[PDB]
Amino acid sequence: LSTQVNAMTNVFNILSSQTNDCCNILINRLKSEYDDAIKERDTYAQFLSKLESQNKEISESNKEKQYSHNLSEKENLKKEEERLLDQLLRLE
Amino acid sequence: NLKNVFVQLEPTSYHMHS
Amino acid sequence: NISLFRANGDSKLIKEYGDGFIPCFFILESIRGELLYVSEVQSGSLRKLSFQELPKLTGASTMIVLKLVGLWCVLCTYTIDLNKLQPINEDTVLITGTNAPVLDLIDGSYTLLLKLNKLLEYSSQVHEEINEISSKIEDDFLSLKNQNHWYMRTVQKSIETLEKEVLQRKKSKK
Amino acid sequence: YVKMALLQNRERTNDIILSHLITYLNDKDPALRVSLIQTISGISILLGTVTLEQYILPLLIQTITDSEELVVISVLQSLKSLFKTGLIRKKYYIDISKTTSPLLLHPNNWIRQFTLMIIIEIINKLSKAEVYCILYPIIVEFNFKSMISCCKQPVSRSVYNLLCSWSVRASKSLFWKKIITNHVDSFGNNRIEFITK
Amino acid sequence: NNITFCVSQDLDVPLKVKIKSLEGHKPLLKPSQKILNPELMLIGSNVFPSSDLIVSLQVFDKERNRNLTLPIYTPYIPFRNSRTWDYWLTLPIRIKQLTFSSHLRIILWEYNGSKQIPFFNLETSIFNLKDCTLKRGFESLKFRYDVIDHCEVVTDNKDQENLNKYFQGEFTRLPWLDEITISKLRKQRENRTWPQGTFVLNLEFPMLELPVVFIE
């Protein structure tokens, strides 16, 4: 990107380019279609993030809430998750 | 009504041919 | 501009110091702007006729170097320059050459200031789109912790209770 | 002589071509032999389709260049879906063999997109072939969503959870066999009328 | 069919074997699949594949440990139906060609999981010590991982059923009551055993006549 830009500048400065396509246009169309698909995936990820946060949170307390909630839940699940195996193995 | 049923496979003989 | 690189394949007899079978690997190198290219093929013996048919990409200003090497000993080394090739031109280059082995490899060569920079800018935009894809993946990953896993464990628990009903029924029959 | 014995028909020679394909590494020659074996696979798909199965299973050991022929091999798998159940298991063996070393992502993505959908059969081997879908998915997020679209498992998480998913995917193919009998009965019936509603 | 004693070169064509039944171990799904259990968290941990039992047949040569006969394998139905076939199969070695030194072998290859399908092994003898090839008759076998074999008790009763095929002195009313003995062989299904590391299979290869064998 920026490196290719600087190299292009150095090409238009340190020397004179006499040269003045299909794969480029094809890559452009492919990048466009991929951009559209990534946009659809971005909308899907928007709904997914909407289900993730579930609230506006005012974006001031959003970070702290996202930090606390996940930790609390992750600390909560392991207990029962390790608990069921006891009964299962007991009956078995 | 309908005719005789059509089987999905047929048995080899191997008996009288022996 | 752009110079298209498409190798038909390699048909020849290649031998090595040590005796052994190796998979044919066609190496493609460039002077500047491009990367290291390779082509996978399977022969394994001395004399072979194979077709690559693997499309490759290289920079505008560069010299395509096609060197066949087993996968290990070097079969053949062939140099090709796009300097002789003109704009919007498509042709084929058949290189019959010998170093260790006496070989032959057919590789076709085709072609495709502001336009180049525009193309590079487009590729850069594609790169930004890739970063956006990384952001989307990060979004889907950071979306939620383990949830449905507890639902699977819940299904296992349902199987445990069902097994309890089955064991109770068996106990009833017993 | 090899092509002669291969063309000979005496199906025992075809089974003898297995060791030939195993030791074929000494011969670096063209794909012409594989083309003769392909025509032999067609003529086998005519009469000896049971043997065509066993030959095709062994034919997955080719391991040769020009991967463009592997697409025709996939079409040959779709053609192997024709009748023989042994051909299905053989195509499953070829499915795992192809699952080990891939070639083209997208083509095999759509391929497996149809194949995994056709993998819901309750046949013992069909489940084994259905288990390769997880191994395929290993080689990400975009593919995760694209696969989640056709995903039949709500609680799916990982490979083990995918095993629990397949455990929840348990179905009976007996009524499906009877349904196939109804399909053949429909083939014996009159489909002439295209009218609707 | 007729029984008679006919030597190797005297006997003409190649052997064939019909194979039918087995014995459910009941330790797994009835196809001997995956080793079912309530502990199946470990089955996910052990990655236990569900295998549908199929079969393969090839003969160990002479007990000289060479290789002669052809491996052969059939199609797949439920082995949870216990795969009762009575399906005939054969290979290209005549009785005239068949060396009196020879032995049968079989490998039951199931269909299990990813790159997975099971394998079980067994072997037996072709002809009698009296030179009659399996007495050209019905039988039943048992096999473990190695060094196991077949006996005759209820298989000896089945061998008496093969003596019905072996043409002991017989009459027409005896034949009707041999339909009643189709009812009796139907009643013979009552068999029960629960061994492990080994299995049983019911395999009948009754021919017309008693072979005999010699050199060429």
XYZ file of C-alpha atoms in Angstrom:
697
model
C 0.000 0.000 0.000
C 2.056 2.912 1.337
C 5.268 1.097 0.414
C 4.019 0.562 -3.136
C 3.034 4.233 -3.208
C 6.505 5.365 -2.141
C 8.024 2.953 -4.656
C 5.754 4.437 -7.321
C 6.911 7.928 -6.361
C 10.530 6.788 -6.547
C 9.679 5.314 -9.947
C 8.264 8.659 -11.074
C 11.295 10.461 -9.645
C 14.556 8.495 -9.779
C 13.793 7.351 -13.334
C 11.503 7.741 -16.345
C 8.920 5.033 -17.025
C 8.348 4.391 -20.727
C 5.452 2.030 -20.037
C 2.122 3.851 -20.243
C -4.903 -5.085 -17.217
C -7.304 -8.017 -17.566
C -6.066 -9.589 -14.334
C -6.388 -6.174 -12.691
C -10.014 -5.713 -13.745
C -10.790 -9.311 -12.781
C -9.186 -8.786 -9.373
C -11.239 -5.601 -9.082
C -14.503 -7.433 -9.759
C -13.484 -10.212 -7.371
C -12.600 -7.648 -4.702
C -15.954 -5.945 -5.253
C -17.932 -9.177 -4.914
C -15.842 -10.081 -1.870
C -16.597 -6.626 -0.472
C -20.323 -7.238 -0.925
C -20.104 -10.673 0.693
C -18.054 -9.222 3.548
C -20.741 -6.548 3.838
C -23.432 -9.208 4.202
C -21.226 -10.909 6.785
C -20.874 -7.491 8.415
C -24.652 -7.177 8.683
C -24.835 -10.702 10.079
C -22.088 -9.747 12.532
C -24.081 -6.602 13.292
C -27.108 -8.660 14.290
C -24.778 -11.042 16.125
C -23.180 -8.157 18.018
C -26.688 -6.856 18.674
C -27.508 -10.177 20.325
C -24.135 -10.006 22.076
C -24.565 -6.636 23.789
C -28.382 -6.782 24.003
C -28.308 -3.176 25.244
C -27.102 0.282 24.220
C -25.017 0.568 27.397
C -24.365 4.248 26.513
C -20.894 3.089 25.370
C -19.408 4.567 28.554
C -20.101 1.503 30.702
C -20.027 -0.876 27.727
C -16.387 -1.914 28.154
C -16.640 -2.565 31.896
C -19.875 -4.510 31.420
C -18.365 -6.569 28.600
C -15.406 -7.266 30.883
C -17.443 -8.260 33.945
C -20.288 -10.242 32.353
C -18.143 -12.695 30.382
C -15.910 -13.342 33.395
C -18.889 -13.926 35.691
C -20.580 -16.316 33.258
C -17.353 -18.186 32.494
C -16.756 -18.552 36.228
C -20.349 -19.727 36.676
C -20.636 -22.419 33.988
C -17.619 -24.566 34.924
C -19.158 -25.601 38.254
C -22.290 -27.224 36.820
C -20.345 -28.397 33.769
C -18.096 -30.386 36.100
C -21.086 -31.265 38.290
C -23.196 -33.220 35.780
C -20.403 -35.741 35.148
C -20.668 -36.884 38.766
C -24.316 -37.921 38.435
C -23.814 -39.345 34.941
C -20.892 -41.527 36.022
C -22.813 -42.400 39.193
C -25.761 -43.911 37.319
C -23.582 -45.414 34.582
C -56.084 -54.154 -8.775
C -52.285 -53.973 -8.805
C -50.157 -56.734 -10.330
C -47.421 -58.836 -8.719
C -44.934 -56.881 -6.604
C -41.517 -55.980 -8.012
C -38.549 -57.135 -5.933
C -35.447 -54.967 -5.548
C -33.140 -57.985 -5.826
C -33.034 -61.635 -6.901
C -31.515 -64.739 -5.190
C -28.806 -66.916 -6.744
C -29.554 -70.603 -7.312
C -26.354 -72.536 -6.505
C -28.431 -75.583 -5.493
C -29.861 -77.574 -8.407
C -27.066 -76.184 -10.579
C -24.611 -77.914 -8.249
C 1.163 -3.416 -17.256
C 1.172 -7.164 -16.606
C 2.816 -10.271 -18.060
C 0.785 -13.470 -17.747
C 2.678 -16.631 -16.822
C 1.140 -20.009 -17.645
C 3.308 -23.124 -17.841
C 2.116 -25.968 -20.062
C 4.350 -28.463 -18.278
C 7.647 -30.337 -18.403
C 8.373 -33.345 -20.612
C 11.857 -34.813 -20.336
C 14.314 -37.283 -18.838
C 15.942 -36.144 -15.590
C 18.508 -38.080 -13.555
C 20.380 -37.505 -10.293
C 23.597 -38.589 -8.569
C 21.756 -40.764 -6.064
C 19.072 -43.204 -7.183
C 15.575 -42.404 -5.941
C 12.073 -41.218 -6.797
C 11.110 -37.571 -6.336
C 7.955 -35.511 -7.070
C 8.303 -32.981 -9.896
C 8.295 -29.383 -8.660
C 8.406 -26.475 -11.104
C 10.033 -23.388 -9.595
C 9.236 -19.894 -10.867
C 11.322 -16.893 -9.808
C 11.249 -13.172 -10.608
C 13.742 -10.307 -10.372
C 11.614 -7.639 -8.689
C 8.067 -6.958 -7.523
C 6.881 -10.564 -7.568
C 7.085 -13.504 -5.167
C 8.380 -17.082 -5.252
C 6.107 -19.333 -7.309
C 5.842 -23.124 -7.422
C 3.996 -25.880 -9.287
C 3.220 -29.378 -8.003
C 3.500 -32.462 -10.217
C 4.108 -36.206 -9.913
C 6.461 -38.260 -12.087
C 9.042 -40.066 -9.963
C 11.179 -41.725 -12.638
C 13.953 -40.565 -14.972
C 11.989 -40.052 -18.193
C 8.620 -38.331 -17.826
C 6.040 -36.219 -19.649
C 3.953 -33.969 -17.410
C 1.642 -30.960 -17.635
C 1.524 -28.263 -14.952
C -1.435 -26.107 -16.029
C -1.147 -23.933 -12.917
C -1.750 -20.192 -13.512
C 0.909 -17.944 -11.965
C 1.218 -14.210 -11.302
C 4.265 -11.949 -11.596
C 5.157 -8.255 -11.702
C 5.296 -6.100 -14.825
C 9.062 -5.616 -14.826
C 10.774 -8.948 -14.140
C 12.409 -12.012 -15.683
C 10.587 -15.320 -15.281
C 12.935 -18.116 -14.246
C 11.523 -21.621 -14.660
C 13.597 -24.318 -12.971
C 12.397 -27.910 -12.674
C 13.488 -29.605 -9.450
C 12.527 -32.959 -7.948
C 10.968 -33.283 -4.500
C 15.617 -33.885 -3.988
C 17.638 -32.886 -7.053
C 17.581 -30.108 -9.650
C 16.258 -31.339 -12.995
C 16.571 -28.322 -15.289
C 17.267 -24.584 -15.173
C 15.665 -22.314 -17.774
C 15.675 -18.517 -17.993
C 12.984 -16.453 -19.718
C 12.805 -12.691 -20.259
C 9.688 -10.611 -20.906
C 11.923 -7.865 -22.304
C 11.555 -9.328 -25.793
C 7.784 -9.586 -25.370
C 5.653 -6.610 -26.409
C 2.412 -5.125 -25.004
C -0.894 -7.001 -25.412
C 1.080 -9.969 -26.742
C 0.514 -13.657 -26.010
C 2.846 -16.497 -26.984
C 4.548 -19.671 -25.773
C 8.130 -20.333 -24.692
C 9.472 -23.865 -25.078
C 12.795 -24.230 -23.285
C 14.907 -27.251 -24.183
C 18.061 -27.161 -22.087
C 20.600 -29.313 -20.292
C 22.743 -29.049 -17.181
C 22.897 -32.305 -15.226
C 20.007 -33.865 -17.298
C 18.992 -33.083 -20.876
C 15.468 -31.729 -20.531
C 12.534 -29.878 -22.094
C 9.897 -27.675 -20.452
C 7.044 -25.825 -22.158
C 5.910 -22.608 -20.469
C 3.621 -20.093 -22.160
C 4.075 -16.353 -21.685
C 1.345 -13.761 -22.220
C 0.728 -10.120 -21.328
C -2.088 -8.051 -19.829
C 2.570 4.640 -15.083
C -0.812 5.662 -13.670
C -2.574 2.372 -14.422
C -0.011 0.363 -12.447
C -0.376 2.609 -9.401
C -4.155 2.377 -9.743
C -3.947 -1.421 -9.805
C -1.673 -1.434 -6.755
C -4.141 0.894 -5.042
C -6.958 -1.522 -5.874
C -4.977 -4.419 -4.411
C -4.374 -2.235 -1.358
C -8.132 -1.712 -1.108
C -8.552 -5.480 -1.265
C -6.026 -5.693 1.569
C -8.051 -3.208 3.617
C -11.064 -5.401 2.875
C -9.073 -8.352 4.223
C -8.383 -6.373 7.394
C -12.121 -5.709 7.545
C -12.611 -9.466 7.247
C -10.269 -9.887 10.209
C -12.406 -7.346 12.058
C -15.537 -9.308 11.150
C -13.942 -12.539 12.366
C -12.967 -10.731 15.561
C -16.581 -9.583 15.881
C -18.009 -13.083 15.437
C -15.439 -14.506 17.861
C -15.806 -11.836 20.551
C -19.583 -12.018 20.067
C -20.140 -14.729 22.674
C -18.356 -17.215 24.924
C -19.346 -20.878 25.245
C -23.139 -21.149 25.129
C -24.405 -23.961 22.906
C -21.741 -26.203 24.445
C -23.769 -26.122 27.655
C -26.748 -27.054 25.481
C -24.822 -30.079 24.227
C -23.969 -30.974 27.817
C -27.663 -30.427 28.543
C -28.493 -32.928 25.808
C -26.043 -35.310 27.469
C -27.881 -34.726 30.744
C -31.144 -35.500 28.952
C -29.521 -38.725 27.781
C -28.563 -39.364 31.407
C -32.140 -38.902 32.613
C -33.361 -41.047 29.717
C -30.836 -43.675 30.785
C -32.268 -43.310 34.281
C -35.751 -44.020 32.932
C -34.411 -46.990 30.969
C -32.571 -48.337 34.011
C -35.683 -47.811 36.131
C -37.750 -49.676 33.546
C -35.194 -52.486 33.454
C -35.313 -52.482 37.251
C -39.095 -52.742 37.049
C -38.937 -55.706 34.678
C -36.234 -57.303 36.834
C 1.243 -55.830 -22.343
C -0.070 -54.031 -19.264
C -2.721 -52.206 -21.280
C -3.547 -55.500 -22.987
C -4.093 -57.375 -19.728
C -6.062 -54.387 -18.451
C -8.240 -54.389 -21.570
C -8.760 -58.144 -21.267
C -12.235 -59.197 -20.136
C -11.700 -62.511 -16.682
C -12.292 -59.685 -14.209
C -9.468 -61.102 -12.089
C -7.005 -59.106 -14.190
C -8.719 -55.894 -13.097
C -8.044 -56.836 -9.480
C -4.499 -57.674 -10.555
C -4.219 -54.098 -11.805
C -4.326 -52.956 -8.173
C -0.779 -54.108 -7.429
C 0.087 -52.674 -10.840
C -1.182 -49.271 -9.718
C 0.725 -49.738 -6.463
C 4.041 -50.423 -8.200
C 3.281 -47.986 -11.029
C 5.705 -45.501 -9.433
C 8.485 -46.918 -11.616
C 6.537 -45.786 -14.679
C 6.552 -41.999 -15.081
C 4.786 -42.164 -18.450
C 1.651 -40.236 -19.549
C -1.909 -40.425 -18.235
C -2.921 -42.554 -21.233
C -2.914 -45.658 -19.033
C -5.210 -43.905 -16.563
C -7.436 -42.985 -19.504
C -7.580 -46.626 -20.560
C -8.432 -47.451 -16.951
C -11.060 -44.704 -17.075
C -12.681 -46.173 -20.178
C -12.371 -49.512 -18.407
C -14.153 -47.839 -15.498
C -16.933 -46.777 -17.854
C -17.287 -50.240 -19.362
C -17.247 -51.458 -15.769
C -19.930 -48.894 -14.950
C -21.890 -50.664 -17.678
C -21.711 -54.302 -16.545
C -19.276 -54.942 -13.697
C -20.244 -51.923 -11.575
C -19.643 -53.850 -8.344
C -16.064 -54.451 -9.491
C -16.007 -50.876 -10.781
C -16.418 -49.855 -7.153
C -13.422 -51.818 -5.887
C -11.344 -50.635 -8.838
C -12.300 -46.996 -8.260
C -11.480 -47.266 -4.562
C -7.986 -48.462 -5.594
C -7.969 -45.817 -8.340
C -7.801 -43.098 -5.680
C -4.162 -44.094 -5.182
C -3.223 -42.424 -8.482
C -1.543 -39.437 -6.788
C -0.631 -37.802 -10.095
C -0.380 -34.344 -11.656
C -3.039 -32.521 -13.686
C -5.546 -32.071 -10.862
C -8.111 -31.055 -13.493
C -8.822 -34.774 -13.881
C -9.795 -34.959 -10.204
C -12.892 -32.935 -11.077
C -13.830 -35.609 -13.603
C -13.088 -38.063 -10.801
C -15.603 -36.208 -8.640
C -18.068 -36.471 -11.511
C -17.115 -40.149 -11.525
C -18.077 -40.224 -7.847
C -21.418 -38.647 -8.708
C -21.619 -41.394 -11.324
C -20.586 -43.857 -8.615
C -23.640 -42.750 -6.644
C -25.670 -44.489 -9.368
C -26.495 -47.953 -8.020
C -23.928 -50.061 -6.148
C -23.813 -49.538 -2.384
C -20.226 -50.755 -2.448
C -19.559 -47.906 -4.851
C -20.853 -45.549 -2.168
C -18.429 -46.913 0.415
C -15.657 -46.819 -2.185
C -16.538 -43.210 -2.963
C -16.377 -42.591 0.775
C -12.876 -44.067 0.841
C -12.004 -41.776 -2.054
C -13.697 -38.979 -0.110
C -11.403 -39.486 2.872
C -8.424 -39.948 0.555
C -9.276 -36.605 -1.039
C -9.893 -35.173 2.427
C -6.287 -35.957 3.334
C -4.765 -33.954 0.474
C -6.893 -31.212 -1.103
C -6.487 -29.325 -4.391
C -8.937 -26.458 -4.920
C -10.794 -24.896 -1.987
C -13.837 -23.314 -3.660
C -14.719 -26.184 -6.034
C -14.378 -28.631 -3.141
C -16.311 -26.198 -0.953
C -19.362 -26.367 -3.214
C -18.686 -30.063 -3.808
C -18.694 -30.801 -0.078
C -21.623 -28.385 0.246
C -23.721 -30.778 -1.830
C -22.042 -33.953 -0.562
C -22.517 -33.195 3.138
C -26.168 -32.503 2.366
C -26.289 -35.909 0.689
C -24.410 -37.374 3.663
C -27.473 -37.380 5.918
C -28.236 -40.982 4.933
C -28.532 -43.385 7.868
C -26.288 -45.967 6.199
C -23.354 -47.051 8.372
C -20.833 -45.955 5.742
C -22.793 -42.783 4.992
C -22.184 -41.673 8.573
C -18.465 -42.329 8.160
C -18.479 -40.230 4.995
C -20.502 -37.612 6.864
C -17.804 -37.427 9.535
C -15.282 -36.184 6.969
C -17.124 -32.858 6.753
C -15.650 -31.788 10.088
C -12.145 -32.752 8.974
C -12.714 -30.770 5.783
C -13.763 -27.655 7.762
C -10.453 -27.766 9.657
C -8.497 -26.387 6.702
C -12.410 -19.804 8.496
C -15.082 -17.521 9.952
C -16.723 -16.807 6.594
C -16.697 -20.547 5.973
C -18.080 -20.967 9.493
C -21.074 -18.792 8.626
C -21.514 -20.326 5.173
C -21.541 -23.757 6.814
C -23.785 -22.489 9.615
C -26.344 -21.659 6.928
C -26.862 -25.337 6.076
C -25.976 -26.498 9.598
C -28.477 -28.930 11.111
C -26.904 -28.632 14.566
C -27.959 -25.724 16.855
C -25.761 -26.845 19.763
C -22.663 -27.542 17.643
C -19.367 -26.182 18.982
C -16.366 -28.356 18.095
C -15.369 -31.834 16.868
C -16.663 -33.562 20.001
C -19.753 -31.349 19.941
C -19.990 -32.260 16.264
C -20.027 -35.888 17.385
C -22.871 -35.006 19.739
C -24.444 -33.248 16.760
C -24.245 -36.399 14.650
C -25.610 -38.228 17.687
C -28.596 -35.880 17.541
C -28.693 -36.453 13.781
C -29.774 -40.083 14.231
C -32.361 -41.120 11.635
C -33.895 -44.222 10.041
C -33.257 -45.008 6.368
C -35.762 -47.873 6.238
C -38.628 -45.486 5.521
C -36.213 -43.799 3.116
C -35.725 -47.103 1.304
C -39.499 -47.487 1.194
C -39.623 -43.910 -0.091
C -37.182 -44.938 -2.811
C -39.571 -47.785 -3.584
C -42.282 -45.135 -3.856
C -39.988 -43.207 -6.193
C -39.559 -46.249 -8.431
C -43.315 -46.782 -8.211
C -43.719 -43.183 -9.360
C -41.303 -44.011 -12.175
C -43.681 -46.831 -13.050
C -46.561 -44.371 -12.789
C -47.610 -41.549 -15.116
C -45.605 -38.329 -14.777
C -47.073 -36.995 -18.037
C -49.189 -34.304 -16.360
C -47.210 -31.136 -15.614
C -50.255 -29.256 -14.301
C -50.246 -27.700 -10.828
C -52.613 -26.231 -8.221
C -27.504 -83.868 -5.668
C -25.362 -86.989 -5.296
C -22.636 -87.937 -2.856
C -19.673 -89.915 -4.139
C -15.931 -89.817 -3.553
C -14.036 -87.977 -6.265
C -10.294 -87.291 -6.236
C -8.435 -84.049 -7.021
C -7.585 -84.414 -10.698
C -10.782 -86.482 -10.929
C -12.760 -83.542 -9.553
C -13.077 -80.779 -12.129
C -13.741 -77.128 -11.305
C -12.976 -74.369 -8.699
C -14.363 -74.026 -5.171
C -17.164 -71.750 -3.993
C -18.491 -70.890 -0.537
C -21.877 -69.675 0.626
C -21.767 -67.738 3.893
C -24.723 -66.812 6.089
C -24.808 -66.237 9.821
C -22.923 -65.047 12.894
C -23.181 -64.620 16.656
C -24.044 -61.255 18.167
C -21.673 -60.382 21.039
C -24.246 -57.797 22.226
C -21.385 -55.625 23.543
C -22.078 -52.935 20.946
C -24.667 -51.918 18.409
C -25.728 -55.253 16.886
C -23.409 -54.610 13.923
C -20.498 -54.785 16.406
C -20.415 -51.016 16.009
C -18.579 -48.484 18.183
C -18.780 -50.423 21.484
C -21.921 -48.718 22.842
C -21.993 -47.420 26.442
C -23.348 -44.694 28.858
C -19.712 -43.634 29.292
C -19.861 -42.336 25.721
C -18.136 -39.097 26.712
C -15.118 -41.400 26.479
C -16.467 -42.681 23.156
C -16.142 -39.100 21.972
C -12.772 -39.047 23.701
C -11.709 -42.369 22.176
C -13.292 -41.278 18.888
C -15.108 -44.598 18.573
C -16.464 -45.038 14.996
C -19.628 -47.004 14.226
C -18.564 -50.003 12.163
C -20.850 -52.025 9.894
C -19.477 -55.548 9.659
C -18.719 -56.840 6.171
C -16.653 -59.856 5.128
C -13.724 -60.940 2.968
C -12.417 -64.362 1.952
C -8.980 -65.587 0.856
C -7.159 -68.890 1.387
C -3.868 -69.359 3.245
C -1.811 -71.672 1.038
C -0.806 -75.205 2.093
C 0.200 -73.998 5.564
C 3.377 -73.325 3.602
C 2.576 -69.666 4.259
C 2.624 -68.815 0.561
C -0.224 -66.952 -1.139
C -2.508 -68.561 -3.710
C -6.230 -67.826 -3.580
C -8.124 -64.596 -4.234
C -9.390 -62.083 -1.709
C -13.085 -61.389 -2.322
C -15.678 -59.118 -0.699
C -19.445 -58.596 -0.924
C -21.983 -55.705 -0.507
C -23.362 -54.179 2.690
C -26.644 -54.719 4.479
C -27.325 -54.353 8.182
C -24.904 -56.299 10.354
C -27.384 -55.238 13.032
C -29.683 -57.568 11.148
C -26.666 -59.810 11.809
C -26.001 -59.879 8.050
C -27.578 -63.235 7.238
C -26.588 -63.816 3.644
C -26.183 -67.419 2.550
C -24.362 -65.572 -0.216
C -22.193 -67.623 -2.536
C -18.760 -66.436 -3.653
C -15.817 -68.016 -5.460
C -12.314 -67.796 -6.899
C -10.275 -69.240 -9.800
C -8.519 -72.397 -8.535
C -9.871 -75.822 -9.519
C -9.996 -78.959 -7.347
C -7.679 -80.661 -9.810
C -5.489 -77.596 -9.357
C -6.243 -77.433 -5.631
C -3.403 -78.819 -3.566
C -4.610 -81.128 -0.801
C -2.352 -78.894 1.238
C -4.365 -75.678 1.526
C -6.388 -73.746 4.084
C -9.218 -71.207 4.063
C -8.949 -67.769 5.668
C -11.340 -64.878 6.214
C -11.178 -61.269 7.324
C -14.288 -59.435 8.437
C -13.883 -55.820 7.411
C -16.526 -53.559 8.905
C -17.260 -49.939 7.972
C -16.514 -47.628 10.866
C -15.504 -43.973 10.574
C -13.177 -41.415 8.991
C -10.547 -43.443 7.119
C -11.951 -46.165 9.338
C -13.467 -49.581 8.825
C -12.785 -52.467 11.046
C -10.781 -55.657 10.632
C -11.145 -59.085 12.223
C -9.237 -62.260 11.349
C -9.852 -66.009 11.097
C -8.603 -69.163 9.348
C -9.540 -72.838 8.857
C -8.864 -76.003 6.843
C -10.138 -76.756 3.338
C -10.502 -80.534 3.098
C -10.939 -83.305 5.662
C -8.204 -85.423 7.154
C -10.341 -87.972 5.280
C -9.678 -85.773 2.217
C -13.337 -84.809 1.763
C -13.482 -81.054 1.297
C -15.205 -79.794 4.434
C -16.958 -83.121 3.849
C -18.454 -81.094 0.987
C -20.824 -80.030 3.735
C -22.372 -77.442 6.039
C -20.475 -76.118 9.057
C -20.087 -73.539 11.827
C -16.959 -71.831 13.130
C -15.440 -69.797 15.967
C -12.443 -67.461 15.998
C -10.423 -65.170 18.266
C -7.543 -62.734 17.636
C -5.234 -65.686 16.969
C -4.995 -69.449 17.557
C -8.726 -70.244 17.596
C -10.979 -72.653 15.723
C -14.285 -74.433 15.154
C -16.002 -77.308 16.951
C -19.090 -79.464 16.478
C -21.859 -79.867 19.047
C -24.873 -77.903 17.886
C -22.726 -77.589 14.786
C -22.581 -81.380 15.027
C -26.374 -81.357 14.985
C -26.161 -79.028 11.975
C -23.681 -81.542 10.558
C -26.384 -84.178 10.969
C -28.601 -81.813 9.013
C -25.774 -82.050 6.500
C -26.097 -85.820 6.816
C -29.608 -85.197 5.526
C -27.816 -83.568 2.607
C -25.166 -86.339 2.699
C -27.873 -88.853 1.762
C -28.211 -91.236 4.674
C -30.960 -93.766 3.933
C -34.095 -91.764 3.291
C -37.800 -91.987 2.434
C -40.635 -89.780 1.116
C -42.590 -89.330 4.370
C -39.218 -88.609 5.965
C -38.945 -85.714 3.410
C -42.307 -84.250 4.456
C -41.140 -84.526 8.025
C -37.981 -82.942 6.678
C -40.226 -80.003 5.920
C -41.255 -80.474 9.507
C -37.487 -80.495 9.988
C -37.429 -77.164 8.206
C -39.692 -76.279 11.113
C -37.148 -77.991 13.368
C -34.169 -76.161 11.859
C -36.340 -73.083 12.322
C -36.610 -74.096 15.976
C -32.810 -74.420 16.086
C -32.580 -70.612 16.218
C -32.871 -70.811 20.019
C -29.061 -70.871 20.450
C -27.381 -68.656 23.060
C -23.832 -67.794 24.134
C -21.999 -64.694 25.391
C -18.233 -65.048 24.856
C -15.748 -62.227 24.210
C -12.600 -61.615 22.165
C -13.971 -64.357 19.934
C -17.024 -64.930 17.758
C -19.065 -67.586 15.987
C -20.372 -67.800 12.415
C -22.736 -70.258 10.713
C -21.388 -71.193 7.282
C -22.794 -73.940 5.082
C -20.875 -75.235 2.076
C -22.763 -78.436 1.382
C -21.970 -79.842 -2.036
C -23.466 -82.779 -3.881
C -20.574 -85.208 -3.372
C -17.639 -85.894 -1.076
C -14.442 -84.704 -2.639
C -11.146 -86.546 -2.407
C -7.782 -85.028 -3.270
C -4.332 -85.996 -4.477
C -1.497 -84.662 -6.583
C -1.690 -84.202 -10.345
